[PDB]
């Protein structure tokens, strides 16, 4: 049982060694993702963990993987708009993917970004910067219990959130257009203009949907307590970036946290120059009650283990014909 | 009913009106400390608030406030430092203080604080700042419920922070010199050297006496574990400075979150040049895993209110020869 | 939009007004559950929701209610053995279920059953009956927070449990065959072994499958601590009775709480004279450190709206031949 | 160092030996309680801890204490009232107290009562007993998450109640005098009528004084909810018992959970006969809404180890010379 492995992160090597003994198999970590230049090296392998930087496109790819004896694809993410369905029905090519990576990590930090703001530390560390180091009024806070968080769309992801706000004794409030009886005892389920008017702190746990696209702007923002706090760990194309530095500028809302941008794309995950990185990116980052983060909500010990040893284990499964949690297809 | 309010803070102004309906009294603001220049504005008053800057020495302000008919001091911070107790007695002056303001308050800016030291943000951005958006496994996070707290001290405060941080599934060790059964739901007593090997967040929760002045030295931050987090909202003169630079500088401890310095008092809460600050916090301020803050792990609105609304209380009573909750010696 | 409603609830029909104004409808409750015999009562009538006593096994019902437009079989339970597929296939009628009720209501159920036990309420009741108002070193308690949980399989319930006793501080240990990363805040997976040694309260959450008939009997009471705690709201099955009572006789465990034992069929939900009711739940019965419910822990105001609602919902969308929810075909 | 325990009970004594190791100090256990009858076994002891049964009254006892070097008196519980406080100042006795037993230990078992009521599974087992094994809407029941508590009082134990019930999303009121900014983040203060009239479940946390005595009588039975339950784990006389019975007898109440009841002394801690019994104990009994327990809401292996340790600590210390944590007016 040799496994391939392609595009591996510096954290997934420092977990070989164990996923190998905990699952029986020997892992070929191979540096770059598959592509027709380097299937060829899944010859000695009875499967392939992959991480597609771009689109999986070229039958020559699909068409060898058969050749080999190659009955899956393990994709190590959730994300399957890389892989042409078409060709992998045309190859008997399972897909199978990791729907849940851990839904804390991005939990945890949507309460830390919004905990932070509202403290208010950079706007501390700002006024420090200046040499001022008082307590002005316009920099108090108040305690996690005596504030009203908001979700828009629940999902395993904000049901953490409510879970772990309620728990510090704040009033957790969710629109949802799906009700979900276990997440009761830490939400209560309202439409999406109490959420929004009520809320001291929201947070998006939307799909992103051609229906939900820009679902946060202008008029939105207006209808928001003025010392609101807007937290977006899901999909940065739910907020209409303009209308956020707007109303950020404008004092409609008092801080952001966001794990996600619009056109993001662009630059995240990479290293880029100065004359790379987009104007409103700058913007938000010179702002010290905005805190911005390379979509990294994910990224614990926990999700990289499980993007890894998930996907093995149906990708084995599927090697030994036995059955699969995952499968996309 | 009239009470003197001495020297109020800006968001304390801001409750005076809501207050005076609250009690059912009047509140006399006077914008600076009592001092033999402003005593005699205590004539028309029931009694006094005190928030004293500096040393309350002369004695003719304190005969003054028996000559007037005022039966105490309300202090409505903690520290009684300022106030000369011989003349007190002297006077038949009973002194009460504020020792609760709101242990929520504070408790809350230590997680806070180690919960974004925890996800790295303020690394992420140092990163993003030379143009790196990716995600290398030195800036990798974990879940809060995967951590050990270690709490030095317990007392009102660490107990609320052991609260929180079980509460998101946490282990919580404590070392403390007196046992309090109602906070064994939330942590585990343990040693002192326990508590510093094993836990990955440290918070400490000590008070500063002879005894405990650098009470976290050179060669406890050898003991800690080196991805550590060290977080001090109780008094900075706990913590060696210098041995916590240079231990974040060799990667001994992972990083620090501060709300309180040794020599803050130089700076902490006045506006001042740069060549007026000291140069170990411009090493701190200047770490991207490290978080400082001007003591304000108090400044939330409770708190503010809790201050005048305690002491007032109090002050009221003893002038109606009632009970005061909070006397001191 | 008029829905036939067939063996209601003396609490079903506490809530058809406000159903019916919810959804825009009307019910039509009938009596009796459906049959070849009262079936010419949904003619006026645009879907049907189900709760049958017993097999639905005529075809003189599965044809005429297509005669009639009728295009689903709502059934208001998770209960799907009663239907007869081959027919149901044979009419194009679909069929819906209701496979989450409110898993607090079992939870909680769980849980308190637990807690009267651990506080051996009923053995101080038998006690006192006798005259004996003491407080023997036998009948000593625990608090929460130092007991160990165990949990046989998990699910939506049992995920509840652990959240719930987690929360009072007690740890709690988990074995099941799948891994869900989102209780892990909750509790620690764990081998079977492991958990039956360990626990100090132990809690079934496992399906019945025949691979877990009786899957607690003789030898596993044998291996649980002496002071154990058993309780089973999952399914009767899955514990050997005699094997139970003969462990509560010989103090092999400490006390037992069954909402539901094998052969509960002959009596549970059901009106009987003393000869009809089984010598084993007789033995269970008389035991003051044993609590038998009649299967009711799914029994709350949430679980029965819910089993009304979902089950309303999907059988008026199935109507309007939108799509739905709870689908089973 | 030897230290006499008098009176211990059974419990008490099968921690000795650990006790003695964890102290590094020796137990002389006397079976009864200090008299003048066996004060002489004192003559080799270092101090004292004290569980009397009946009044200290003689003189010679006292002045022997004192004779012997035994610098206090080591109450292991909490009431002084058999301690003729004036013999002790004549004879340099310092007197402690163990005030705080374990305050979750009484919190438990009022949460505990509260919830096997709420489930009304007492309810269940007498209509079990006449062969109903239904579930009629008589006996519905509901989450906790769903419910208000409302406590009279709070303290350490009111307090702890609130924790564990807001930890399973249940909304906390309370009713008190003295404000705590620690418990805000479980509880919300409200009037006292406010309480009786919104609360689902109440909990009694208030002391026994002249005024509180029938504090919760006709009238305020009459202000609660009729689906209301009452715990008192707290103090018997401040129940109307009358009034009590009336209201469950009526249904002006559902329910009620009593560890103490008015007149207790006669029967509770002893082995008696039925006719020694009061008539009040024998309707309530009988009721399958209520439970009474032998005031053992204390009576976990924390409290009573607690009870031993805490004062054999202050007592050991104060024969040093040390400070007390407990002593006590």
Same mark, same amino acid.
């Given at each position: 049982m040799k496994i391939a492995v392609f595009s591996p992160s510096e954290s997934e090597r420092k977990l070989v060694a164990a996923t190998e003994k905990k699952f029986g198999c020997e892992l070929k970590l191979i540096?770059?993702? =598959?592509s027709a230049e380097n +299937?060829?090296? +899944?010859? *000695?392998?009875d499967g392939v963990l992959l991480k597609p930087l #771009?689109? =999986? *496109?070229?039958?020559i790819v699909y068409k060898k993987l058969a050749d080999y004896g190659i009955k899956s694809i393990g994709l190590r993410? +959730?994300? $399957?708009? $890389?892989? *042409?369905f078409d060709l992998a029905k045309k190859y008997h090519l399972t897909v199978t993917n990791v729907? +849940?990576?851990?839904?804390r990590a991005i939990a945890e930090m949507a309460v830390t970004q919004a905990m932070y703001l509202n403290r208010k530390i950079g706007e501390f560390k700002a006024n420090m910067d200046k040499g001022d180091f008082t307590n002005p009024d316009s920099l108090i806070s108040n305690e996690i219990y005596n504030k009203t968080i908001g979700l828009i769309g629940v999902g395993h992801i904000g049901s953490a959130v409510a879970q772990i706000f309620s728990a510090m004794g704040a009033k957790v409030l969710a629109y949802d257009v799906i009700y979900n009886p276990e997440v009761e005892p830490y939400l209560t389920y309202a439409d999406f203009d109490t959420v929004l008017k009520e809320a001291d702190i929201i947070s998006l746990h939307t799909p992103l949907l051609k229906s939900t696209?820009?679902?946060?702007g202008k008029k939105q923002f207006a209808e928001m307590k003025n010392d609101a706090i807007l937290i977006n760990?899901?999909? #940065?194309? =739910?907020?209409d970036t303009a209308a956020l530095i707007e109303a950020l500028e404008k004092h409609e809302i008092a801080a952001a946290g966001l794990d996600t941008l619009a056109?993001?794309?662009?630059? !995240?995950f990479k290293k880029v120059d *100065?004359?790379?990185?987009p104007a409103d990116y700058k913007k938000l980052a010179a702002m010290p009650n905005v805190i911005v983060t390379?979509?990294?909500?994910? !990224?614990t010990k926990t999700s990289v283990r499980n993007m890894i040893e998930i996907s093995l284990r149906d990708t084995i499964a599927l090697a030994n014909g036995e059955r699969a949690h995952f499968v996309v297809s």
């Open positions: 540096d770059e993702s =598959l +299937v060829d090296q +899944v010859a *000695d392998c #771009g689109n =999986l *496109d070229d039958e993410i +959730v994300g $399957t708009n $890389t892989i *042409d729907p +849940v990576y851990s839904p696209e820009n679902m946060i760990a899901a999909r #940065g194309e =739910l907020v056109h993001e794309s662009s630059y !995240f *100065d004359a790379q990185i390379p979509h990294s909500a994910y !990224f």
